[PDB]
Amino acid sequence: GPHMATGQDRVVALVDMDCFFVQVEQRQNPHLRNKPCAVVQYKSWKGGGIIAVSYEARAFGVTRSMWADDAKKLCPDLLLAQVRESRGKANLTKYREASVEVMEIMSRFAVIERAAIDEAYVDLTSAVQERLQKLQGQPISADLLPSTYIEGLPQGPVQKEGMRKQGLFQWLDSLQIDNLTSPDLQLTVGAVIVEEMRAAIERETGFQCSAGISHNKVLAKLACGLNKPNRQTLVSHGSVPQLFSQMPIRKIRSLGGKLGASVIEILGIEYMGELTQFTESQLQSHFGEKNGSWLYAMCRGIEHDPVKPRQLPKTIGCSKNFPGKTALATREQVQWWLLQLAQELEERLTKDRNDNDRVATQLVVSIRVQGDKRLSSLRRCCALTRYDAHKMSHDAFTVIKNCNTSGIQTEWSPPLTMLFLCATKFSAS
DNA sequence: ATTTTGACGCT
DNA sequence: AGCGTCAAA
Ligand SMILES: [Ca+2]
Ligand SMILES: [Mg+2]
Ligand SMILES: [Mg+2]
């Protein structure tokens, strides 16, 4: 009752760019705008692998991971843009730079946590308080929320936009605008701010995005996906029981893999809401102390993970796969590709040092051997003392050379199916 | 023969 | 330290 926390103490948003790499390419090439199109890496093998897909193309069934040749069977007029290749490998610089554009705009509004190349969490609690003080009891107009959905509404006693407006009207009609401590009002002001933030992103970059607004990161992330693209969704604390009552467990962030499968298998449930019937101790007994407490609160819509103040990636990495017959089988091959990776890494590190006043101090080398299901077969670290590609490639070879079983120095066995260099452990400079 | 990435947890 | 999990385009 009066002491039961309800996880309504924060306003958190998650902003996620729509079909991000596709929008980057469509901004650059107006011929691709408003078309079924996809972004692909490589082209020799089956037309290249698709990594991003416009919503027009998704209507034909085109998805990520599809070979372009196969996507063309579903969508013969599909347009394609290719990821840049440099030093023999795909190079994602254009998308990293577009990401910086968006992150820098979002940072003007509030502290953000960079969650991926195209998404960030926003802690809006303080901004909401400020805006509520500015508003001075003034009601919030639907015109301030032109792309907002209120999850769960409309309810009670045939076009998409009509339903959105009906739900928003029910919500705003029911709000108590004089209570500055009302969580629902705080979320609503949050959504007003997010409309402003999304408008700024689109104005200043050309890119559209979706967003979720709720009381914590997990619900904000879930909310964001409910009405893509180019829309935002408010998930209130009160919407949680109905929302979770038919929500597959795997849809909640962190439960899409083995742990989620085990929750389903061990407990014999399917939906997030069903978790409420277990005690905290029961959940801890199956999934561990940390996961158990997290599940117990999360299934009630409560999560405390903070929006971390971090706009920049914590690592800078470069990797290449060598699938099937292309696996690296000679020492020379391994050294040449380590050099290519190290040259890209050097370029990115030097730019990072100039832009962000920091230097990486550890180099992580990872390889995969043909026959291993795991992404990485072996990982070794060494000191990163100079931004020099020849030194980094030599040091990586030094730390992995003993993995070569082959009695012949010139041959590498078992062949390598992946090389990965990652700069970590940044210090101020 | 998806590939190329991050962030963080466990021991 | 080195390995595993989960998530992005
Ligand atoms: Ca996205
Ligand atoms: Mg994303
Ligand atoms: Mg996606």
**Cβ atoms of residues A397 and A334 within 8 Å:** yes
The Å distance, Cα A309 to ligand 2 centre, comes to 18
Beta bridge partners, A182, equal none
**How far is A18 from A102, CA to CA, in rounded Å?**
12
- As given in the structure block, the two tokens for residue A179 are 């209570």
Q: Is the CB of A259 under 7 A from strand C?
A: yes
**Separation between Cα atoms, residue A204 and residue A124, nearest integer Å:** 21
Same domain, A258 and A162: no
- The answer on whether A17 is annotated among ligand-binding residues is yes
> Do A360 and A392 fall into the same domain?
yes
Q: How far is the CA of A23 from the centre of ligand 2 (A)?
A: 13
Same structural domain for residues A373 and A427?
Answer: yes
Give φ, ψ of A402 to 5 degrees: -70, -5
A365, closest nucleotide (Cα–C1') = C2
d(CA A110, CA A234): 18
Which nucleotide is the nearest neighbour of A49, by CA and C1'?
B2
Calpha distance A236→A215 (Å, rounded) = 8
Which chain C nucleotides are covered by protein, judged by CB under 7 A?
1-9
Which ligand ends up closest to the CA of A221? 2
Nucleotide nearest the Cα atom of A19 (by C1'): C9
Same domain for A197 and A270?
A: no
Report the amino acid identity of residue A177.
I
- Of all nucleotides in the shown strands, which has a C1' nearest the CA of A41? B3
Give the angle A236-A208-A60 at the CA atoms, nearest 5°. 95
Q: Where are the alpha helices (DSSP H) in A232-330?
A: 240-245, 258-267, 280-287, 289-298
Q: Strands A209-214 and A232-234, how do they pair?
A: parallel
Nucleotide nearest to A52 (CA to C1'): C9
In angstroms, the CA A205 to CA A98 distance is 8
In the three-class reduction of DSSP (H, G, I as helix; E, B as strand; rest coil), residue A101 is classed as helix
Beta-carbon contacts of residue A419 (< 8 Å; ≥ 6 apart): A319, A320, A322, A328, A334, A337, A338, A341, A366, A367
Strand order in the sheet with A148-150: A112-116, A119-123, A12-17, A209-214, A232-234, A148-150
Judge if the beta carbon of A264 is closer than 7 A to nucleic acid strand C: no
User: How far is the C-alpha of A203 from the C-alpha of A249, rounded, in Å?
Assistant: 37
- Judge if the beta carbon of A41 is closer than 7 A to nucleic acid strand B: yes
A288 and A316 part of one domain: no
- Pairwise CA distance, residues A94 & A84, whole Å: 8
Gyration radius of chain A over CA positions: 24
Ligand nearest to the CA of A17: 1
Residue type, A174: S
CA separation, residue A12 to residues A132, A289, A350 (Å): 16, 25, 34
Output the DSSP codes for A337-393. HHHHHHHHHHHHHHHHHHHHSEEEEEEEEEEEETT--SS-SEEEEEE--S--HHHHH
Distance CA A63, CA A39 (A): 11
Assess contact for A259 and A282: CB atoms under 8 A.
Answer: no
Between residue 367 and residue 396 of chain A, the positions with Cβ below 7 Å from nucleic chain B are 375
Contacts of A216 (CB under 8 A, 6+ apart): A7, A10, A12, A301, A302, A303, A304, A305
Residue at shortest CA–C1' distance from B6: A116
Token pair belonging to A181: 């401590």
Q: Structure tokens of A280?
A: 């905290």
Residue A341 has phi, psi (to 5 degrees) of -60, -45
Find the DSSP H helices in A20-139.
20-28, 55-58, 68-74, 93-109, 125-135
Please state the domain count of chain A. Answer: 4
Collect all residues with Cβ–Cβ distance below 8 Å to A148 and sequence separation of at least 6: A164, A168, A191, A195, A231, A232, A233, A234
Specify whether the CB–CB gap between A233 and A164 falls below 8 A. Answer: no
Find the helix or strand (DSSP H, E) in which A428 lies: strand A411-428
CA distance linking residue A145 with residue A17, whole number of Å:
19
How many CB atoms neighbour CB A360 within 10 A?
22
Q: How far, in Å, is the centroid of ligand 2 from the Cα of A14?
A: 9
Residues belonging to chain A: 429
A317 and A294, same domain (yes or no): no
Range of the domain at A266: 249-306
| Residue A299, C-beta contacts closer than 8 angstroms, at least 6 positions apart | A244, A272, A273, A274, A275, A276
Asked if the Cβ of residue A198 lies within 7 A of any atom of strand B, the reply is no
Give the distance from CA A351 to its chain's centroid. 23
How distant is C1' of C7 from CA of A400, in Å? 28
Q: Which residues touch A40 (CB under 8 Å, ≥6 apart)?
A: A47, A48, A49, A50, A51, A68, A80, A81, A82, A83
Is the CB of A114 within 7 Å of strand B? yes
Strand B nucleotides where any atom sits below 7 Å of a protein CB: 1-10
- Tell me, what amino acid is at A117? I
| Same domain, yes or no: A225 and A213 | yes
Nearest to A338 by CA among A406, A389, A408, A409: A389
Which residues are paired to A40 by β-bridges?
A50, A82
Return d(Cα A123, Cα A325) in angstroms, integer: 48
Q: Stated in angstroms, how far is A233 CA from B2 C1'?
A: 31
Positions of chain breaks in chain A, given as the residue before each break (C to N > 2.5 Å): 157
A119 touches strand C (CB under 7 A): yes
Contacts of A72 (CB under 8 A, 6+ apart): A47, A78
CA/C1' separation A235–C6 (Å): 24
Q: How far is the CA of A101 from the C1' of C9 (A)?
A: 16
- CB burial of residue A220 (10 Å; 0-12, 13-18, 19+): buried
| Rounded CA separation A381/A399 (Å) | 7
**Element spanning A170, H or E:** helix A160-174
DSSP label at residue A177: T
Q: Long-range contacts: A346-352, Cβ < 8 Å, 24+?
A: A346/A387, A346/A388, A346/A389, A346/A392, A348/A93, A348/A316, A348/A318, A349/A316, A349/A387, A349/A423, A350/A387, A352/A316
Q: Are residues A93 and A191 in the same domain?
A: yes
Query: Which nucleotide is closest to the Cα of A260 by its C1'?
Result: C6
CA distance A296 to A427: 38
For residue A278, give every residue at least 6 positions away whose Cβ sits within 8 Å of its Cβ, in sequence order, or none: A267, A296
Together in a domain, A123 and A238: yes
Report in angstroms the alpha-carbon separations of A171 from A193, A211, A236, A331, A389.
17, 18, 10, 66, 58
Of A265, A285, A306, the residue at which a domain comes to its end is A306
Q: Are A129 and A239 members of one domain? A: yes
Instruction: Report how far apart, in Å, the C-alpha atoms of A384 and of each of A78, A254, A319 are.
Output: 44, 32, 17
Question: What is the rounded distance in angstroms from the CA atom of residue A48 to the CA atom of residue A90?
Answer: 11
One domain for residues A234 and A273: no
Q: For B2, which residue's CA is nearest its C1'?
A: A65
Contact criterion met (CB below 8 Å) for A47 and A256: no
Q: State yes or no: A357 annotated in a binding site.
A: no
Amino acid at A8: Q
- Of A70, A88, A106, the domain-final residue: A88
Ligand 2 is an ion; its neighbours by CB within 5 Å are A 16, 116, 118-119
Q: Which of A53, A88, A123 is the last residue of a domain?
A: A88
A355 and A415 assigned to the same domain: yes
- For residue A315, give the DSSP letter: -
Q: Write the DSSP symbol of residue A148.
A: E
A312: which residues sit within 8 A by CB, 6+ positions away? A114, A356
Resolution of the experimental model, in Å, one decimal: 1.5
Contact A67, A49 (CB under 8 A): yes
CA-to-CA dists, residue A415 to A320, A323, A328, A420, angstroms: 14, 10, 5, 15
Cβ of residue A180 lies below 7 Å from strand C: no
**A122, two tokens:** 């926003």
Number of helices and strands in chain A (H, E): 14, 16
**Angle A289-298/A280-287 helices, nearest 10 degrees?**
130
How far is Cα A346 from Cα A340, in angstroms, rounded to an integer? Answer: 10
Scanning residues 363 through 422 of protein chain A, those with a beta carbon under 7 Å from any atom of strand C turn out to be 374-376, 378-381
